[PDB]
Amino acid sequence: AHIFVKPELVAEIGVKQLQREIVLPGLVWTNPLTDFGGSKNDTITVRVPAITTA
Amino acid sequence: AHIFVKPELVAEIGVKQLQREIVLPGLVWTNPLTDFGGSKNDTITVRVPAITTA
């Protein structure tokens, strides 16, 4: 019968891929040490001080 | 590959040997008697008063 030339319409309506919310980085101790370049094996050794007894 | 001569770097970050909190000294009767020098045998006598019966 009648022929109509139509486009294929693409729409975005706010449907996204559900994906986790990030909380862990803010709670962990990040970068107390920075100069890993300049220490052998990329290892910085932390010194824990001493305690005596009377 | 390339090889480099680096120092071992020792750093303090705030890691400490965990020790408890001192609470007992503030809770015990301390120094009601002081002049232990000036008394025989480094001893001060404490007198507890008399109690009578009828």
Q: What can you tell me about this protein's structure?
A:
With 54 residues, the first copy, chain A, is largely without helices or strands. Chain A is 0% helix and 6% strand. At the A-B interface, strand 1 of A face strand 1 of B. Strand 1 of chain A pairs parallel with strand 1 (9-11) of chain B.
What percentage of the residues of chain A does DSSP assign to strands (E)? 5-15%
Distance between the termini of chain A: 105 Å
- CA radius of gyration of chain A is 30 Å
Helix content of chain A: under 10%
Overall number of strands of chain A: 1
The largest inter-chain interface, given as chain pair and residues per side, is:
A-B, 15 and 13 residues
Question: H/E element string of chain A?
Answer: E
Main beta-sheet annotation of chain A: none
Question: Could you say which structural class the secondary elements and strand pairing of chain A correspond to?
Answer: little secondary structure
Assembly state of the chains shown: part of a larger assembly
Helix count, DSSP H or I runs of 4 or more residues of chain A: 0
User: Which shape of chain A, going by the Cα principal axes?
Assistant: rod-shaped
PDB class: virus
Keywords: Mycobacteriophage, phage structure, Icosahedral, cryo-EM, protein assembly, virus
Entry title: Cryo-EM structure of Mycobacteriophage Douge genome-packed capsid (gp8 and gp113)
Chains A, B: Major Capsid Protein (gp8)
